[PDB]
């Protein structure tokens, strides 16, 4: 029993973390086989960040312009290319700790574990969600750039995030492992800001199922709703609209608890209109939206406390 924001175990990722220095900038890189991935802005100084041309800054670099350090061992760079907003550094050694891996592009609403690193040394691990506005609410200090996000299926690490920047609101932006950013953001210091965010409806719903699987039914009601009547309520409370596809995904959780999705949607609709007042769900005073349906199935018992 219990329900916690839970990260994947981080050791497969830890044995991949290195330090990358170009000139006076130092940050983290990801070492798989004979490649090290990192943010291209490692080639930038503070003044170039205002208006950098990366093609022009990069061509001025050689292989020995880059220092890669794995523990106390220096890796020798023997090739380098730019891929979108990443650098790919070829090194003289394959990482012997390379796990089975994939590079995936995560969709808004999905969750992943972040291994926060400074100087190529892992310092902590936490879970977060890709927000609808393409930011993550992370915890990152100077030097965390090139820290990665990942999920783990069996023994395969699916890398989905590399850290690049912090926006003026205190939330975070970065790229997949192809160097393509999440959201309309760019790796230069300009006036750019998080777009307006919305609550992830699918997740809230899933976490209400989680509550039921663990044994709580207090927020249920005798009502049902149409998909469309729910969305008229949703949209006034700044929830994402629910789609038939989201209703579909909730099938297994629906089947485990015997609660019809649109019946749980009526239950949510009532929580939005009436509040919780004094009452908690799974320990929480508020409606939580950073657990996917998948996160709930993975963590909860397959057997409902009826």
């Amino acid at each position: 029993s219990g329900f916690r924001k839970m990260a994947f175990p981080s050791g497969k990722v830890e044995g991949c973390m290195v330090q990358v220095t170009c000139g006076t900038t130092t940050l983290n890189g990801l070492w798989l086989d004979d490649t090290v991935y990192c943010p291209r802005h490692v080639i930038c100084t503070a003044e170039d960040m205002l208006n950098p041309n990366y093609e022009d800054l990069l061509i001025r670099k050689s292989n020995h312009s880059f220092l890669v350090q794995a523990g106390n061992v220096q890796l020798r760079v023997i090739g380098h290319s730019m891929q979108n907003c990443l650098l790919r550094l070829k090194v003289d050694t394959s990482n012997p700790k390379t796990p089975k891996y994939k590079f995936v592009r995560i969709q808004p609403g999905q969750t992943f574990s972040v291994l926060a690193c400074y100087n190529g040394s892992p310092s902590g691990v936490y879970q977060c969600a890709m927000r609808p506005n393409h930011t993550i609410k992370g915890s990152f200090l100077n030097g965390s750039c090139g820290s990665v996000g990942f999920n783990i299926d069996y023994d395969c690490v699916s890398f989905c995030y590399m850290h690049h920047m912090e926006l003026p609101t205190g939330v975070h932006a970065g790229t997949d492992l192809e160097g393509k950013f999440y959201g309309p953001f760019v790796d230069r210091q300009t006036a750019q800001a998080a777009g307006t965010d919305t609550t992830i409806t699918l997740n809230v719903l899933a976490w209400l199922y989680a509550a039921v699987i663990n044994g709580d039914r207090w927020f249920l009601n005798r009502f049902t709703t149409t998909l469309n009547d729910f969305n008229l309520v949703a949209m006034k409370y700044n929830y994402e609209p629910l789609t038939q596809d989201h209703v579909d995904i909730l099938g297994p959780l629906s089947a485990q608890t015997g609660i019809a999705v649109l019946d749980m949607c009526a239950a949510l609709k009532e929580l939005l209109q009436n509040g919780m007042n004094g009452r908690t769900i799974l320990g929480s005073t508020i409606l939580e939206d950073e657990f996917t349906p998948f996160d709930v199935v993975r963590q909860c018992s397959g057997v409902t406390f009826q």
Partner: peptide
């Protein structure tokens, strides 16, 4: 809005 800093690169980190």
């Amino acid at each position: 809005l800093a690169a980190x």
